[PDB]
Design an enzyme around this catalytic site. Structure first.
Site, PDB file in Angstrom:
ATOM      1  N   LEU A 121       0.835  -1.188   0.000  1.00  0.00           N
ATOM      2  CA  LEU A 121       0.000   0.000   0.000  1.00  0.00           C
ATOM      3  C   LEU A 121       0.875   1.245   0.000  1.00  0.00           C
ATOM      4  O   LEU A 121       2.002   1.231   0.501  1.00  0.00           O
ATOM      5  CB  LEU A 121      -0.932   0.017   1.214  1.00  0.00           C
ATOM      6  CG  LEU A 121      -1.921  -1.143   1.340  1.00  0.00           C
ATOM      7  CD1 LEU A 121      -2.903  -0.874   2.457  1.00  0.00           C
ATOM      8  CD2 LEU A 121      -2.657  -1.370   0.037  1.00  0.00           C
ATOM      9  N   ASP A 122       0.351   2.323  -0.574  1.00  0.00           N
ATOM     10  CA  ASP A 122       1.066   3.587  -0.596  1.00  0.00           C
ATOM     11  C   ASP A 122       0.872   4.322   0.725  1.00  0.00           C
ATOM     12  O   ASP A 122       0.177   3.861   1.633  1.00  0.00           O
ATOM     13  CB  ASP A 122       0.594   4.449  -1.764  1.00  0.00           C
ATOM     14  CG  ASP A 122       0.756   3.759  -3.100  1.00  0.00           C
ATOM     15  OD1 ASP A 122       1.875   3.787  -3.652  1.00  0.00           O
ATOM     16  OD2 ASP A 122      -0.237   3.191  -3.598  1.00  0.00           O
ATOM     17  N   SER A 123       1.505   5.490   0.836  1.00  0.00           N
ATOM     18  CA  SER A 123       1.304   6.330   2.010  1.00  0.00           C
ATOM     19  C   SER A 123      -0.089   6.947   2.028  1.00  0.00           C
ATOM     20  O   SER A 123      -0.671   7.129   3.106  1.00  0.00           O
ATOM     21  CB  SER A 123       2.380   7.410   2.055  1.00  0.00           C
ATOM     22  OG  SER A 123       2.709   7.838   0.746  1.00  0.00           O
TER      23      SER A 123
END
Ligand SMILES: CCCCCCCCCCCCCCCCCC(=O)OC[C@H](COP(=O)([O-])OCC[N+](C)(C)C)OC(=O)CCCCCCCCCCCCCCCCC
Ligand SMILES: CCCCCCCCCCCCCCCCCC(=O)OC[C@H](COP(=O)([O-])OCC[N+](C)(C)C)OC(=O)CCCCCCCCCCCCCCCCC
Ligand SMILES: CCCCCCCCCCCCCCCCCC(=O)OC[C@H](COP(=O)([O-])OCC[N+](C)(C)C)OC(=O)CCCCCCCCCCCCCCCCC
Ligand SMILES: CCCCCCCCCCCCCCCCCC(=O)OC[C@H](COP(=O)(O)OCCN)OC(=O)CCCCCCCCCCCCCCCCC
Ligand SMILES: CCCCCCCCCCCCCCCCCC(=O)OC[C@H](COP(=O)(O)OCCN)OC(=O)CCCCCCCCCCCCCCCCC
Ligand SMILES: CCCCCCCCCCCCCCCCCC(=O)OC[C@H](COP(=O)(O)OCCN)OC(=O)CCCCCCCCCCCCCCCCC
Ligand SMILES: CCCCCCCCCCCCCCCCCC(=O)OC[C@H](COP(=O)(O)OCCN)OC(=O)CCCCCCCCCCCCCCCCC
Lengths: 177, 87, 606, 171, 128, 459, 50
Positions: B41-43
């Protein structure tokens, strides 16, 4: 800005804080759930369009114009949580948060109503006064010469001893006393 | 008013919310699964997750504590510490 | 006569008994709020009897029981006045505070200081009943200051919260400017008419009565939160919900309107004061309704609503209809208090959430509070044959067919439409639609106290306007001949407001986004009045306090002129005198010079 | 009891009750209950207390002050005669203040009693109040916190000089 | 574009609109590190005096004593009479006194002149 | 007046022959007995004063001040016995002796029929207070405070002695009963102008006037608690009593020579209340509030109307009681936290609830909540000043607004909010402090039931 | 408080009220004016000649 453990805010931290503020204000403007979902996806697409940019000056200018855009289109009064600062019930229970050192001034007549509780309080105080010198000796040899650089405290390295400066953050009053 | 909370209920509710996320396969996540590494997952996904948990539990997590909430166990422990449960 | 005065004085003594009961108590009181509630119900019955006597015959009396003081000619006695206003307001206030204390028994159940809360509520009620039954201006001022101090103590109930302290101090400040007005009026009455009792004031009847009327207008502006001194009323929402529902809705804030009602023989012969009151009321009602149009806090919406209703009361005072104004006071108390109680129920069921953006879907989840909210909003907007119809439409009918300011009438009508708009805005965003509140649901309203209090105020808001308007004697000539369009003005304006706000909500439901305009930011941010005034005036006053008075004058200059310069002069003279070199030759030369000066220049040998 | 000449009051004229409707008014029942439960025990208790008071009887008197010469017949700087005149003047000042209080109480009673027609039926009380206030103002006003009989004598002499000059210039 | 936010004395510029916030140069990083070091050292001193089990009293703050001594007992030693101080003292010291004196003297002269002609209504005035 | 003087001087062998532990009990007991005895002065008549002898008399103005003094002495004995706990026994007896001597001078001051005897006692009151301030005060600048206080009083009062001796030589007597009947008009000249200045400046300094008030936030601050109580409660009222007695000889020159001080005191109360708004010290804030209230009394005496005089004497008594209670509360906070800073110890209502109630009552009486005698005096002065001129209502309303502002600022800062974290020596309130607070409060609340005994000689 | 409550007619106020009642009754019975504009008799006052 004002951080206990860091001296500055990184670029990624600024971008994430802007993203959260913009999404909260967009939720405030768009009170219905489906409408907020649609416009949140549009905002997420706008944020993901410029995600892979390696120019630092261009990313900085994009961040600055995004902050200007947010300030032009913010809500006059956004939704604040009830316990969040600026909320309706923020710091409401501070009048009931009596500190624990007031129990030492109780009369012995009213101390007899809670025998086991005051026995546990006595052994807690014995533990604190036994561990204080060990924890200050641990803290003395871990601080570099010239003072600490940040405000982070070390944990207890060995077995038996408690972390340094633990009393007033363990015995803090409950949220609903 | 104000029903009490436990670690079991907190963990069940936080796993419910994380299970309703479409970007996470529900048969793979657990209580200590990471976000960037174990789940990919991204930030921004982490930020939206934190906002979802704030909306679920009804209280605000500050950003300086939100950046460090990286697995469901730390979210459970943060909520347990902020709401003073198992007293 | 022997039953009238006995029952009135025993109602007052019955109200003051539980204060002495709690002050002389050692152990923990066994259900003290129940004792206060039972006392207030008994006092409501006991005060309900003399109003039946007054309705039957018209018996108004004055009881000057205890002589207090005699300052030369002036004589101050403990004097109470049983007239139309006292008998029509005391049971309404007692009924409303009975319902409020039952709602407080439900609401503040988990508060560890519930006994102090009920003692403060009873103290406020005692001071207000001192106010409304007062005969001379000194007793009126005692009630004035008592309700002000109780408002200060009750707004900042959670004293660990800073915003409560700011709101309480701000309310005190605005009420003290009202006190300036009250003091000026009382001083004029003493100096020019040699009395403080109202009977001599009405008997002498001054013609050049502009100055005391402006003093009373300023006092009512301060107390009833008219324009200029308004924002303390919406700022006073920091306290608990029962405090708002009693004081800042139905009882405390109508004291200025009541004070101007009591002096109606003075204002009825003064066109200047009437025009001033009409303009101020129209300004207040339209400005506060326009501010209420785009608010999101439910309690702030109801606070702006009751300020708009107080502006309407000032309007109908200004058109020389004071008995209609009093009828509107008695009407408005019921449904405003019950609207606040239902808003408090919604707040309590959703874990202290006061935002209407986090509500919705409560039409079927909480049916009784939904029913009461719909009935109260319909009675507030002026639905026919509810309680608000018997006062508000007569106000509009008298305002249309009178020698009136045109602009004041126009903004009165526009404010009526705005009241309709924000009422259906509350109903739409708080009941209709899909839920927006957090996931865990602990919705419950099955408590006998809350249900019973809301039920009593619901029966009141259904039938009390009819009963009161059919029981009061005719003190004026009702205007009942008017053209068709002037008769249908209030209903058409309310219907137009309902249609406009229904369309506004439907357009809100769409999937479009628009940037906010300057009108929206003007209405949402309260017209920029608090943000400018509360940042500008305290800045100037506190900077003048420190940079001019505290430092420049008494720490620098008043210290410079008298003591420091004198001390330095004596120091310099001492250093010149004692700096001799200790030589005999110089001393004897000085002796020779002294002898020569005395002999020649001063002529001491003549 | 008081004296009904110093504090006058017109005779009370109450109308007869005419029950046009058949519904019983609760006021008559409440008056019956008040006389049964409240008036009778209070009357009995007052009867017992008055019986206790009638066993021994003692009297108190109203103090009478004889007239002494006033400040007009006192030599200047003669502290005895001036002292007596000053005490007499202060006593009459107090009595005049209470006379104005009596007239004010009369006016307030008339205004409350006459009801809505008070502007027509309280003409005599208003005239008495105006006359007594004019007399009080001409006698005691504008003297200061250090008022004395000499100040009042000087004020009356100045007013009499003004009146004599006014009647000389109008002759 | 968008209307530029102009700051005022009573409405400061936001931290997200400040152009000096986005500075990444090493001098500003060194300054921020030095400020954090000072703050952390002072916090360490306070928490060492704060968590002592054998302490029962007041952790004295030299900054507060410094503030009170500066607010009270330094103003006259650091005062020099010049044009600005004398001008402000004459404006705020004798200005309002003269203004109110002339206002009250004019009002009382007008009232006393109206009284002696019998033009002022003093019919029921016997309280003063 | 010898029936009160002789027990007061007999208090001296009582405190000098008591045991090492029974001095406070004996002195408090017998002073309370004499305070009960002081009620016999209430035999006042509507025409004549209560004239005891050639040297002593007591009318209805001096009687409330006497009762206040004789009641205030045991309060100071109860207040001052905690900070003198570790003191030497001889120094403790010397402190009690100075209090007794000050009470003796004060009760001989209010009853002096001759004006020069009033002057002698009124300046004999300087020595015990100066000794108390400069010896038992806690700070460095108590010596400077004593110098300022002494020299302001003496520089103001030496021309008063010269003018009183001139009046004695010109009129033939300084007896106040004679001068009521032998008084003469004082014409407009430069000689009479300086007569008015000489007769008035001593009491203008002692009250104090705005501009001559620089000694007050020093003497009221560096004094001990008993010194602050006797300075705020009684010693400021010597100036008021002096102007009430001495204005009889200064007519009709007062009506235009009173203009500059009326403008100084009308504008001065606004300045002192604004100073109170921005005070970092609690004791200094109470002292400046005292300056404002005494400015009100100055205006009331200077306009010389009956309502103003009644308001002035009622306001004097009420402010004495209120200022004494406020100084006692501030002293209790000082004993708890060992600092006079107002921002240091906050949120004490969560720790000291009944003391917070006492604070609330004292603050409410400070801002003249009706029907307290504070409001009665302030209201009567406001009515009389409105009769003087109409813009005085603007000035009085502004003063009332700022007075409420700073009183509630005091209360909200000290008692409300979040408590200080690092302060952990907040002991529960003793019975002695609560008894002191109640003995300040209950007479003040009871006097509202019968306010006619504090309304001066022209009630 | 008990002593102050039962003070024997403090400053003659009640006596003044009783005497005012007596004087008002006596003057009202004979048609006399209740109060005159002059405190002292003009007959026993010699104005300065001008
Ligand atoms: C708790 C149990 C107590 C005992 C219980 C058993 C006995 C109970 C009593 C039974 C009846 C006793 C006889 C009747 C009562 C006494 C009758 C009587 O003559 O009383 C003497 C008088 C009656 O008035 P008066 O006219 O005769 O005399 C007044 C006194 N002078 C003239 C000096 C001014 O006094 C009282 O009645 C005093 C009690 C009054 C009750 C109300 C007090 C209110 C206090 C408010 C303070 C602030 C006011 C501010 C505003 C003022 C107005 C602007
Ligand atoms: C706290 C600081 C401020 C203190 C201010 C004190 C008051 C200010 C004014 C005081 C003037 C001096 C006393 C005057 C007494 C007058 C009595 C009298 O009979 O007067 C009529 C007499 C008249 O003289 P006579 O009475 O002998 O003559 C008979 C009358 N005629 C004239 C008609 C023939 O006045 C005088 O003799 C002169 C009075 C003026 C004196 C001027 C010098 C002093 C100037 C002020 C000094 C103030 C203190 C300075 C120091 C401060 C500290 C460092
Ligand atoms: C005096 C100058 C120096 C000041 C400082 C003195 C310090 C030393 C103190 C010594 C002792 C005290 C002296 C002063 C005493 C004053 C009191 C006093 O004696 O008063 C006499 C007054 C006298 O009243 P009166 O004058 O009307 O009585 C008529 C006179 N006789 C008795 C002869 C017929 O007493 C009262 O007023 C008592 C009345 C009855 C009791 C009160 C009843 C009502 C109480 C309140 C009821 C609820 C109301 C609503 C409340 C709502 C919530 C807040
Ligand atoms: C019919 C006639 C109508 C006439 C209308 C026009 C005349 C009156 C104009 C308005 C005057 C009063 C309003 C201005 C001052 C208001 C001060 C106040 O209470 O501010 C509130 C503020 C806290 O509230 P806020 O900032 O809103 O909080 C939000 C969350 N933090 O609180 C604070 O900031 C605390 C400040 C404390 C110190 C205040 C100092 C200023 C006091 C000014 C008094 C002026 C009195 C004038 C009297 C004149 C008499 C002739
Ligand atoms: C009182 C009389 C009520 C009946 C006559 C007026 C009806 C009216 O004003 O209708 C307008 C409107 C409903 O009409 P509309 O919005 O077109 O339809 C909604 C979908 N059924 O809106 C409403 O009917 C709602 C508002 C009615 C307010 C009535 C009381 C004021
Ligand atoms: C309104 C009244 C205004 C005048 C009031 C009297 C003067 C001011 C108050 C007394 C003096 C205040 C003071 O302490 O001044 C300090 C100054 C120097 O004192 P110093 O001896 O250096 O200090 C000791 C160690 N710190 O002390 C000096 O320089 C000595 C000054 C002595 C002045 C005595 C009073 C004389 C008055 C008549 C003059 C003719
Ligand atoms: C500093 C700290 C803060 C303040 C503390 C108090 C300070 C002030 C105290 C004294 C104030 C001044 C004295 C009172 C003046 C009252 C008005 C007055 O009478 O002024 C005198 C005079 C007025 O003129 P006129 O009426 O013609 O005089 C003839 C009189 N036979 O006026 C004039 O002719 C103008 C002035 C001429 C010079 C006067 C000098 C003597 C008075 C001051 C000493």
């Amino acid at each position: 800005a004002f951080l206990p453990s860091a001296a500055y805010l990184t670029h990624q931290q600024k971008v994430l804080q802007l993203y959260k503020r913009a999404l909260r204000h967009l939720e405030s403007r768009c009170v219905h759930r489906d409408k907020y979902r649609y416009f949140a996806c549009l905002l997420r697409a706008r944020f993901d369009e410029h995600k892979n940019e390696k120019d630092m000056v261009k990313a900085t200018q994009l961040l600055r114009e995004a902050e200007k855009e947010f300030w032009h289109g913010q809500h006059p009064q956004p939704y604040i949580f009830p316990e969040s600062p600026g909320g309706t019930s923020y710091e409401r229970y501070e009048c009931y948060k009596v500190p624990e050192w007031c129990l030492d001034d109780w009369h012995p007549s009213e101390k007899a109503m809670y025998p086991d509780y005051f026995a546990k309080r006595e052994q807690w105080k014995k533990l604190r006064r036994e561990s204080w010198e060990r924890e200050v000796k641990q803290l003395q040899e871990e601080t570099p010469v010239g003072g600490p650089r940040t405000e982070a405290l070390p944990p207890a390295r060995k077995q038996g001893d408690l972390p340094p400066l633990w009393w007033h953050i363990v015995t803090r009053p409950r949220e609903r006393p | 008013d104000a029903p009490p909370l436990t670690l079991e209920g907190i963990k069940d509710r936080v796993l419910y919310v994380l299970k309703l996320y479409d970007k996470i396969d529900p048969e793979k996540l657990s209580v200590n699964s990471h976000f960037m590494k174990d789940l990919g997952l991204d930030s921004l996904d982490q930020v939206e997750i934190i906002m979802a948990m704030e909306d679920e539990f009804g209280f605000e997590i500050p950003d300086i504590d939100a950046e460090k909430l990286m697995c469901p166990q730390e979210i459970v422990d943060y909520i347990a510490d902020k709401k003073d449960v198992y007293e | 006569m022997n039953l009238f005065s006995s029952l009135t004085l025993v109602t007052l003594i019955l109200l003051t008994m539980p204060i002495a009961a709690i002050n002389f108590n050692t152990h923990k009181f066994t259900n003290y709020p129940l004792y206060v509630k039972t006392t207030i119900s008994c006092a409501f019955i006991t005060s309900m009897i003399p109003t039946m006597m007054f309705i039957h015959t018209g018996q108004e009396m004055i009881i000057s029981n205890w002589h207090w003081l005699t300052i030369q000619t002036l004589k101050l006695s403990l004097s109470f006045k049983m007239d139309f206003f006292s008998m029509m307001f005391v049971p309404v206030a007692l009924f409303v505070t009975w319902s409020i204390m039952e709602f407080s028994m439900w609401y503040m159940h988990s508060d560890p200081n519930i006994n102090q809360f009920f003692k403060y509520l009873l103290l406020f009620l005692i001071t207000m009943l001192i106010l409304v039954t007062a005969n001379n201006l000194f007793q009126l001022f005692i009630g004035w200051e008592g309700v002000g101090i109780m408002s200060f103590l009750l707004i900042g109930w959670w004293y660990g919260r800073t915003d409560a302290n700011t709101a309480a101090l701000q309310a005190i400040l605005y009420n003290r400017i009202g006190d300036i007005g009250f003091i000026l009026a009382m001083a004029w009455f003493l100096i020019n008419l040699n009395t403080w009792d109202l009977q001599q004031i009405f008997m002498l009847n001054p013609n050049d009565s502009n100055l005391p009327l402006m003093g009373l207008i300023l006092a009512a502006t301060g107390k009833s939160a008219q324009f200029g001194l308004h924002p303390w009323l919406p700022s006073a929402m920091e306290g608990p919900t029962p405090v708002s529902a009693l004081l800042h809705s139905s009882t405390m804030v109508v004291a200025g309107i009541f004070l101007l009602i009591r002096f109606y023989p003075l204002t009825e012969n003064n066109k200047f004061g009437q025009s001033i009151m009409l303009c101020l009321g129209a300004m207040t009602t339209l400005f506060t309704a326009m501010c209420a149009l785009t608010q999101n806090d439910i309690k702030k919406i109801i606070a702006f609503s009751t300020s708009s209703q107080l502006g309407l009361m000032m309007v109908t005072i200004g058109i020389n209809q004071p008995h209609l104004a009093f009828l509107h006071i008695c009407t408005h108390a019921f449904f405003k208090a019950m609207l606040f109680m239902c808003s408090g129920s919604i707040i309590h069921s959703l874990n202290d959430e006061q935002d209407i953006r986090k509500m919705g879907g409560l039409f079927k989840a909480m049916p009784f509070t939904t029913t009461a909210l719909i009935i109260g909003s319909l009675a507030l907007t002026g639905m026919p044959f509810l309680t608000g119809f018997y006062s508000k439409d007569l106000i509009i009918e008298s305002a249309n067919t009178s020698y009136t300011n045109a602009w004041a009438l126009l903004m009165t009508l526009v404010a009526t439409s705005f009241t309709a708009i924000y009422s259906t805005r509350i109903i739409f965003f708080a009941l209709l639609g899909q839920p927006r509140f957090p996931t865990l649901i602990n919705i419950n309203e099955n408590n006998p106290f809350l249900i019973n209090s809301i039920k009593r105020l619901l029966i009141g808001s259904l039938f009390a306007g009819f009963i009161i308007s059919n029981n009061i004697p005719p003190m004026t000539i009702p205007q009942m001949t008017m053209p068709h369009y002037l008769k249908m003005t209030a209903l058409t304006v309310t219907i137009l407001g309902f249609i406009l706000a229904l369309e506004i909500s439907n357009t809100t439901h769409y999937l479009k986004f628009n940037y906010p305009s300057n009108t929206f930011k003007f209405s949402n941010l309260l017209g920029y009045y608090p943000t400018i005034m509360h940042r500008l005036t305290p800045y100037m006053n506190l900077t003048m306090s420190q940079k001019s008075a505290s430092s420049l004058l008494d720490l620098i200059w008043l210290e410079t002129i008298l003591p420091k310069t004198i001390s330095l002069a004596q120091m310099k003279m001492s250093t010149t005198i004692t700096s001799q070199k200790g030589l005999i030759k110089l001393y004897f030369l000085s002796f020779l010079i002294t002898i020569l000066i005395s002999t020649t220049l001063l002529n001491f040998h003549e | 009891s008081w004296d009904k000449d110093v504090y006058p009051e017109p005779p009370r004229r109450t109308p007869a009750p005419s029950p046009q409707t058949s519904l019983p008014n609760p006021i008559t029942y409440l008056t019956k209950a008040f006389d049964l439960l409240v008036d009778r025990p209070v009357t009995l208790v007052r009867e017992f207390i008055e019986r206790q008071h009638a066993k021994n009887k003692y009297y108190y008197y109203h103090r009478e002050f004889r007239r002494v010469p006033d400040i007009t017949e006192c030599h200047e700087k003669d502290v005895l005669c001036m002292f007596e005149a000053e005490m007499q003047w202060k006593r009459d000042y107090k009595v005049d203040q209470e006379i104005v209080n009596i007239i004010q109480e009369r006016l307030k009673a008339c205004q409350q009693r006459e009801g809505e027609s008070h502007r027509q039926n309280c003409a005599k009380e208003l005239q008495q109040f105006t006359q007594v206030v004019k007399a009080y103002q001409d006698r005691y006003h504008d003297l200061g916190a250090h008022y004395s009989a000499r100040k009042c004598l000087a004020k009356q002499k100045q007013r009499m000089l003004a009146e004599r000059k006014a009647t000389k210039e109008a002759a | 574009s968008f209307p530029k936010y102009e700051p005022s004395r009573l409405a400061s510029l936001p931290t997200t609109l400040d152009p000096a916030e986005y500075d990444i140069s090493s001098e500003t990083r060194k300054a921020q590190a030095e400020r954090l070091a000072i703050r952390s050292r002072l916090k360490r001193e306070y928490q060492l005096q704060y968590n002592d089990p054998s302490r029962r009293g007041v952790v004295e703050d030299p900054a507060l004593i410094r503030w009170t001594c500066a607010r009270s007992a330094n103003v006259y030693p650091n005062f020099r009479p010049n044009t600005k101080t004398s001008l402000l003292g004459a404006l705020f010291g004798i200005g309002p006194l003269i203004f109110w004196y002339y206002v009250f003297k004019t009002d009382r002269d007008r009232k006393e002149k109206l009284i002696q002609e019998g033009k002022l209504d003093r019919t029921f005035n016997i309280s003063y | 007046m010898l029936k009160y003087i002789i027990p007061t001087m007999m208090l001296m062998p009582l405190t000098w022959l008591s045991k090492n532990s029974m001095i406070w009990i004996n002195t408090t007991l017998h002073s309370l007995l004499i305070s009960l005895t002081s009620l016999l002065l209430l035999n006042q008549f509507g025409d004549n004063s209560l004239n005891f002898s050639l040297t002593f008399f007591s009318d209805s103005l001096s009687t409330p001040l006497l009762i206040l003094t004789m009641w205030l002495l045991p309060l100071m004995l109860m207040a001052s016995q905690h900070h003198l706990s570790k003191e030497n026994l001889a120094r403790k007896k010397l402190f009690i002796s100075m209090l007794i001597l000050l009470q003796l001078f004060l009760i001989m001051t209010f009853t002096a029929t001759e004006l020069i005897f009033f002057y002698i006692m009124f300046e004999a009151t300087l020595v015990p207070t100066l000794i108390i301030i400069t010896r038992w005060g806690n700070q460095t600048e108590r010596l400077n405070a004593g110098l300022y206080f002494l020299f302001y009083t003496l520089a103001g009062s030496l021309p008063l002695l010269v003018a009183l001796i001139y009046i004695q030589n010109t009129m033939g007597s300084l007896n106040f009963l004679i001068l009521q009947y032998w008084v003469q008009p004082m014409p407009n000249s430069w000689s009479n102008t300086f007569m008015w200045l000489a007769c008035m400046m001593a009491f203008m300094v002692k009250m104090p006037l705005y501009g001559l008030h620089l000694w007050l936030p020093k003497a009221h601050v560096e004094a001990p608690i008993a010194g602050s109580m006797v300075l705020a409660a009684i010693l400021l009222k010597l100036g008021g009593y002096g102007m009430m007695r001495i204005t009889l000889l200064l007519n009709p020159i007062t009506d235009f020579m009173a203009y500059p001080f009326i403008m100084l005191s009308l504008w001065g109360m606004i300045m002192t209340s604004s100073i109170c708004l921005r005070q970092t010290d609690l004791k200094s804030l109470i002292a400046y509030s005292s300056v404002s209230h005494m400015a009100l009394v100055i205006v009331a005496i200077l306009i010389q109307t009956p309502w103003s005089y009644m308001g002035a004497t009622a306001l004097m008594i009420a402010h004495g009681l209120t200022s004494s209670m406020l100084f006692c509360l501030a002293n209790s906070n000082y004993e708890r936290v060992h600092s006079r800073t107002m921002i240091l110890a906050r949120g004490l209502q969560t720790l000291l609830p009944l003391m917070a109630a006492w604070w609330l009552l004292a603050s409410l009486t400070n801002l003249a909540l009706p029907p307290s005698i504070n409001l009665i005096g302030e209201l009567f002065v406001v009515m009389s000043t409105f009769s003087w001129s109409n813009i005085t209502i603007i000035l009085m309303g502004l003063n009332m607004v700022i007075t409420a502002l700073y009183s509630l600022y005091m209360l909200i800062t000290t008692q409300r909010g979040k408590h200080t974290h690092h302060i952990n020596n907040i002991l529960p309130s003793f019975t002695r402090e609560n008894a002191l607070m109640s003995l300040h409060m209950l007479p003040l609340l009871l006097l509202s039931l019968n306010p006619k005994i504090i309304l001066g000689p022209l009630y | 408080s008990t002593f102050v409550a039962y003070l024997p007619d403090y400053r003659m106020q009640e006596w003044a009220r009783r005497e005012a009642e007596r004087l008002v009754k006596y003057r009202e019975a004979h048609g006399l004016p209740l109060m005159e504009s002059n405190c002292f008799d003009p007959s026993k006052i010699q104005l300065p000649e001008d």
